[PDB]
Write a structure and sequence with these properties.
This is part of a larger assembly, with seven protein chains of seven kinds.
Chain C lengths: L20 E3 L3 H18 L11 E3 L2 H4 L3 E3 L3 E2 H6 L4 H6 L4 E2 L7 H15 L2 E3 L15 H4 L6
Chain E lengths: L3 H4 L7 E2 L9 E2 L4 E2 L16 H6 L10 H10 L12
Antiparallel strand pairs in E: 1-2, 2-3
Chain G lengths: L4 H6 L2 H22 L7 H27 L16 H4 L4 H4 L4 H9 L5 E3 L2
Helix pairs in contact in G: 2-3
The chains are: A alpha+beta (about 100), B mainly alpha (about 50), C alpha+beta (about 150), D alpha/beta (about 210), E alpha+beta (about 90), F alpha+beta (about 130), G mainly alpha (about 120).
The structure holds six RNA strands.
GO biological process, one term (chain A): cytoplasmic translation
Subcellular location (chain A): Cytoplasm
GO molecular function, one term (chain A): RNA binding
Chain lengths: ~100, ~50, ~150, ~210, ~90, ~130, ~120
RNA sequence: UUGACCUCAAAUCAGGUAGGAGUACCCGCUGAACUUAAGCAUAUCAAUAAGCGGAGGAAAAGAAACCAACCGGGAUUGCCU
RNA sequence: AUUGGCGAGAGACCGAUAGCGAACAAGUACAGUGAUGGAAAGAUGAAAAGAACUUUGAAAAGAGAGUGAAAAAGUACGUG
RNA sequence: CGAAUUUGGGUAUAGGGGCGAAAGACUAAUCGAACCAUCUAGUAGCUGGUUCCUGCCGAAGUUUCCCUCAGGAUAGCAGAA
RNA sequence: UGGAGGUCAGUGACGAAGCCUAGACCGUAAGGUCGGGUCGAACGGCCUCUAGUGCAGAUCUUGGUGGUAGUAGCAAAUAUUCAAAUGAGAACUUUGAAGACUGAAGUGGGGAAAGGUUCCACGUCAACAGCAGUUGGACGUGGGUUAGUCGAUCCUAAGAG
RNA sequence: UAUCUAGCGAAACCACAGCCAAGGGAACGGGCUUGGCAGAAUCAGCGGGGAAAGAAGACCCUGUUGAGCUUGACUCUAGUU
RNA sequence: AAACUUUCAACAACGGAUCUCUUGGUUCUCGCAUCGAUGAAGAACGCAGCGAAAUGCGAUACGUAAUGUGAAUUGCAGAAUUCCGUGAAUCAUCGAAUCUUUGAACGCACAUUGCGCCCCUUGGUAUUCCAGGGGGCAUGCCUGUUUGAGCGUCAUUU
């Protein structure tokens, strides 16, 4: 998803799926959606992806694979990675001092 | 260098215009902190490394 | 590096905690901003009560099952038993939980009674016409306090 | 600033250079080049133990402890001896606590409020303020604390019917709700016995 | 003589002027600037270079365009023109 | 005191605003109080200084000396009134800087915007 | 002295450009005269007048071009409004307010009601 | 012969879009070592700094393939515990 | 959440060897091939009223005179 | 001192790398591991320093253990409560 | 000692702080006070609070100043002298006269690299030239670089890309 | 050259300074004690002394400090099979 | 005895300590979201009557237009009934343009102000050569248009 995204930087990576596989390569068909095409800007069932917050969602790790890699799942299995392991790590390593010390 | 690039010869020009003393009517201006040409450069003292 | 009768003090500061310290000087400031946010939300959505109506549910675990508390929302079974539709309840300001299930009669009786006394205590403006001048109350939870059985 | 005394690339030359082991600025041809830095003893170096934000600024105090102090401060205002010692011109005041009619709460204009304060006996104290306005001693006078002055009577009310606005502008005298009754003005400088003017309603509400 | 006799042989130019950063830091044999990273599109800057960022950051120079955008947004990026003639 | 949070009671910020205010802001900072009579027939306590107004000096060494404005020297927060100079020992006459707050406006140069300036402040234009 | 913008806008194209040449001539006459006389600030006036004139010529042409492209799509990139790169890639107000038919059906059916409690 | 279609091209084709800056915060990847262990190798520093990629006013997460074992709670986030 | 940007307000903060490196033409002068390194330097007087003029000296300048409240404030200028 | 010659310009090799008719030589006065910046205020049982007065009390270099013998822990001596 | 709350309706342009004082007094001392001189704008006593709070040392940091000391030194490149002029002032400027030297792999005439206006003229000697200076590659003000043929541009080399 | 003069004019070093013998002393004192003695200020040399200066000794020891290198030290590892 | 050394005082020096001030910093809080292929950040070179900086700006160059204010700027010079005014200002505001050469830089290139090509137009006798002026020519990707390629393949036609 990343190499496709950086190749066609004018498209957002909707998803990707395994299509085939051999000894030394894996093959994926990457679903791309053009955010600057009026057809997709309209039909607000899909106009969420042309929102600027969704550009290059594969680089940030927001597609299905990105969610899997970061381990962003509900459960006790994912106690370290529930909202982002760096946020949780920063959450539980901060020294939260108050005006009136506890 | 007697055979110099033109972009060097622009470095040449502002070197010569800047290498002149502070105008003497600046003193007379009100609340003038400026006293002398601090950025003054001389070929005898320091090189301009282009 | 250890001496005398002193307790072993497990202090977790081997890390560079200094860059990650967060001191809450803004505790006073955030309180004023939050009160301002409550003020502006109430002014925006007046005269609705600035908050939803929560059901009264029994806390889990053996430790806290002796106390009821405001849950998330009324289960769909409770909403229909009050004589409503889930969508209509959301608009009129009733918090609705779809994933909670009613398995206790006493809790169910309290919630449907909570809804019935909520309906009789609110008024709803019509979509079309001159809405009656109503005075905004700011706390649905306070007007219907959670009661220990 | 956390990076004070550290926006530098200093590094010690070690021994064998007839100079101290304090780290020194590299480079050359600056005057700053080859100068000590990074230490607490160096010009331009960091301070020893840089002051940090997480120092305990506010102090927890037991609620019963604060209320205990407020009760003592209030009881001190009834002692005419303490008020005189604390520096309030109450020598000619016929009665302490000085209680006025509750109509003072309804006074809207500063002219009538100060006129009442003159008559009820707080005249001398109000003259002691607004004549003691002295320029603050020391570097604090250009940190927005330029002027110092004494504190006048503390007018205590029950319901702000305009008394707070009327006396808001008068130097020294400050208004305090009987419900609140903050200690920081009942015992300024931890000195008991602040001259307090009580209104009739606030006195009743006190019990 | 590795010193003053050798310093005499220093009459060439390892670096020349870089068209991007304008510093005398454009290596000639490497055909790349050592300060701004010319000709690479990304402007060479590192977090470990805390000061070097400060030297060549936004706000260092003129701000031809970015200077006015704060005012433009403040008014709302609004277009058109004013109406009232004069006093 | 300062109740509206927007205005600043900082000495440094107030002094910086004064010493770096532009020409437009300096004009209102160079306000001049009207005389007892000029107040009576206009009704305005003070008016911004103007290049062609007759003024009176009421404070300083120049106390009591009348004059007419020759140049509002806004750059120094000062005004240059005619006939009130100090002779340099060479014989040259250099004008005295004066702050307008120390001057009393004895007469007004009434231009049509000034007539609007008096009306907007509550003046009867007598 | 010097010419002023408001009367210039009245003048048509050809004579506005004609006087542009006139100002450019007289600026040249002062430019050669500046090196002779020790002080000549009048060049400032004509330089300012030149900028005023050709500012109007550029503006008049642009107003005509807007007239050329009035109400027709695909305005030239300099004529269309320069808001912000982020804004021009951002969704329009009509387009953000666009909703699917299923969503709009629910909105009309069950809108956010207005209500209050009489306590 | 002539029309298609499928795939793959070209065009200074019509219309668009990406790059770069900043980077305090945020999302990932990569990733040390000094240090501590009175030595040092697991460990620690640290799933950190540096490096790289990507956005916004916040971002991320987010409406359970959840926690529980209770008279059960009920998206996510944050604070006190 | 936020030590970036813009705007705003405060401080039991520092007060020109401090506080940002930078109160000032500061990331400036300057050094390095380069990556980079990187200073010092505030205050006359209310206002220049910045010492007209005379004399000695080639001149600087001094001595006088003079301004100025003060020249034990003369731009090498708060105090020293 | 006519060639394994010398030298100019261009060019290539970049740090655990380069190059070396080999000395651990040279690699911008830095070489048995360049320079620069950051992690970094790295570490140290080691050296030096450690800023006012007066009053009262006032030692120790020993026990045991330790990769311990330039140090700690423990007991001892001391002060204060 | 720096600052904070209170108080003395404290002190102060008729002089606060500061600084100097082989002048006085108090305290064992840390220090405090007063007198005298300069000085010009704020500053104290007491009850508490707070800290970036007390220096002789750290081959301490920065800045400055000493003895050394009018000392070492200004001794490679064989060497200068006389007169006149300018100029206040000449060992050093200019001219002339001599005397010399580099001795054509020169201290000459040009250039590549590099430098960048030093080239040239006029005015001038506050700094600089190791002494001096009237001179200057210094200071101030200006002037100065003309190409169809000289090169770059074009070509390719090792290479880079 | 040194020397002297005219002009210009540093640096190293420096607790304070600069007479010895003997004693003792941290066991080789300019200072302490006992004696000898001791008369301003100096100039040129000089090389006895100031355990003279130049470097937190480079030789040696210690450090639970490193680094270069080596190997049938221990543990791994690219590569290859 | 002087000279010299040492000590102290007065005055004078060297030096910038102390004290006082502060358009600066720092920390905290609050609010907002705002760069760029419509060309960003940065840089280079220029622009003022007399400017080297700083500040501002770009051959429209310490800026022009629009708006508000209402009579200046200021060191000198100059202009200044421009003054009862669509009108001064190194004014503010800022919505229109200009914005050199660059720079993600975008015709190729760059240690060069190099080399180009296309269109329109003006001139030199000129579709072709040389100039002038104006406008263009980057890469990747998307939608569509046109022209296409492939016995990949279908139908049709002898």
């Amino acid at each position: 998803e990343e190499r496709v995204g950086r190749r066609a930087a004018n498209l957002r990576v909707l998803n990707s799926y395994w299509v085939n596989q051999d000894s030394t390569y894996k093959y994926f068909e990457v679903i791309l959606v053009d955010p600057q095409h009026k057809a997709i800007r309209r039909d607000a069932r899909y106009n969420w992806i042309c929102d600027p917050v969704h550009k290059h969602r594969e680089a940030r790790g927001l597609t299905a694979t990105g969610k899997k890699s970061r381990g962003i799942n509900k459960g006790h299995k994912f106690n370290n990675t529930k909202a982002g392991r760096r946020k949780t790590w920063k959450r539980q390593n901060t020294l939260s001092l108050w005006r009136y010390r506890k | 260098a007697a055979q110099k690039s033109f972009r060097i010869k622009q470095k040449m020009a502002k070197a010569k215009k800047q290498n002149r003393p502070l105008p003497q009517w600046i003193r007379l201006r009100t609340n003038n902190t400026i006293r002398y040409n601090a950025k003054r450069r001389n070929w005898r003292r320091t090189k301009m490394n282009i | 590096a250890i001496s005398k009768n002193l307790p072993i003090l497990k202090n977790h500061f081997r890390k560079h905690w200094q860059e990650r310290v967060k001191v809450h000087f803004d505790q006073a400031g955030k309180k004023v901003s939050r009160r301002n946010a409550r003020a502006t939300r109430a002014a925006k959505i007046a005269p609705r009560p600035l908050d939803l109506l929560r059901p009264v549910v029994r806390a889990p675990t053996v430790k806290y099952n002796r106390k009821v508390r405001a849950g998330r929302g009324f289960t769909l079974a409770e909403v229909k038993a009050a004589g409503l539709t889930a969508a209509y309840a959301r608009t009129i300001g009733i918090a609705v939980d779809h994933r909670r299930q009613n398995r206790n009669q006493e809790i169910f009786d309290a919630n449907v009674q909570r809804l019935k006394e909520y309906q009789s205590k609110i008024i709803v403006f019509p979509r079309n016409g001159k809405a009656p001048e109503a005075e905004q109350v700011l706390s649905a939870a306070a007007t219907f306090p959670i009661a220990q059985p | 600033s956390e990076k004070a005394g550290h926006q530098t690339s200093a590094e010690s030359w070690g021994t064998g250079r007839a100079v101290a082991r304090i780290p020194r600025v590299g480079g050359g041809g600056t005057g700053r080049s080859g100068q000590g830095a990074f230490g607490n003893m160096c010009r331009g170096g960091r301070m020893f133990a840089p002051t940090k934000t997480w120092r305990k600024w506010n102090v927890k105090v037991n609620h019963n402890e604060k209320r205990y102090a407020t009760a003592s401060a209030i009881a001190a205002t009834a002692v005419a001896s303490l008020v005189l010692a604390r520096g309030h011109r109450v020598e000619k005041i016929p009665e302490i606590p000085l209680v006025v009619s509750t109509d003072l709460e309804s006074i809207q204009k500063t002219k009538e409020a100060v006129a009442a304060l003159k008559a009820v006996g707080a005249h001398s104290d109000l003259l002691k303020v607004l004549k003691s306005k002295k320029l603050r001693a020391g570097k604090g006078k250009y940190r927005n604390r330029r002027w110092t002055q004494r504190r006048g009577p503390l007018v205590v009310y029950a319901e702000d019917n305009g008394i707070v606005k009327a006396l808001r502008n008068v130097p020294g005298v400050e208004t305090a709700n009987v419900a609140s009754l903050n200690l920081l003005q009942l015992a300024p400088g931890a000195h008991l016995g602040r001259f307090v003017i009580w209104t009739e309603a606030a006195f009743t509400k006190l019990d | 003589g590795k010193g003053t006799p050798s310093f005499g042989k220093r009459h060439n130019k390892s670096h020349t002027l870089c068209n991007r950063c304008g510093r005398r830091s454009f290596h000639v044999q490497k055909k790349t600037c050592s300060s701004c990273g010319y000709p690479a599109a990304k402007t060479r800057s590192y977090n470990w270079g805390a000061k070097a960022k400060r030297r060549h950051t936004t706000g260092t120079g003129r701000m031809r365009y970015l200077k006015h955008v704060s005012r433009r947004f403040k008014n709302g990026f609004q277009t058109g023109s004013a109406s009232k003639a004069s006093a | 005191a300062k109740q509206s949070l927007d205005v600043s009671s900082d000495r440094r910020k107030a002094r910086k605003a004064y010493f770096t205010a532009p020409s437009s802001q300096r004009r209102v900072l160079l306000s001049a109080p009207l005389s007892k009579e000029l107040r009576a027939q206009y009704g305005i306590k003070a008016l911004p200084i103007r290049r062609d107004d007759e003024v009176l000096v009421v404070r300083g060494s120049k106390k009591g000396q009348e004059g007419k404005i020759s140049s509002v020297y806004r750059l120094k927060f000062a005004v240059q009134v005619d006939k009130v100079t100090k002779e340099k020992v060479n014989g040259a006459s250099v004008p005295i800087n004066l702050h307008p707050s120390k001057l009393v406006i004895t007469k007004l140069h009434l231009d049509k915007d000034r007539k609007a300036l008096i009306q907007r402040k509550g003046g009867k234009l007598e | 002295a010097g010419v002023k913008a408001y009367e210039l806008r009245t003048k048509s194209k050809e004579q506005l450009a004609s006087q542009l040449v006139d100002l450019k001539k007289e600026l040249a006459e002062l430019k050669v005269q500046k090196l002779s006389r020790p002080s000549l600030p009048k060049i400032k006036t004509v330089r300012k007048s030149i900028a005023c004139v050709l500012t109007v010529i550029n503006e008049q042409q642009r107003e005509a071009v807007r007239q050329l492209y009035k109400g027709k799509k695909y305005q030239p990139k300099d004529l269309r409004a320069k808001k912000t790169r982020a804004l021009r890639r951002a969704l329009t107000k009509f387009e953000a307010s666009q909703v699917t038919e299923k969503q709009r059906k629910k909105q009309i059916a069950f809108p956010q009601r207005k209500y209050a409690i009489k306590a």
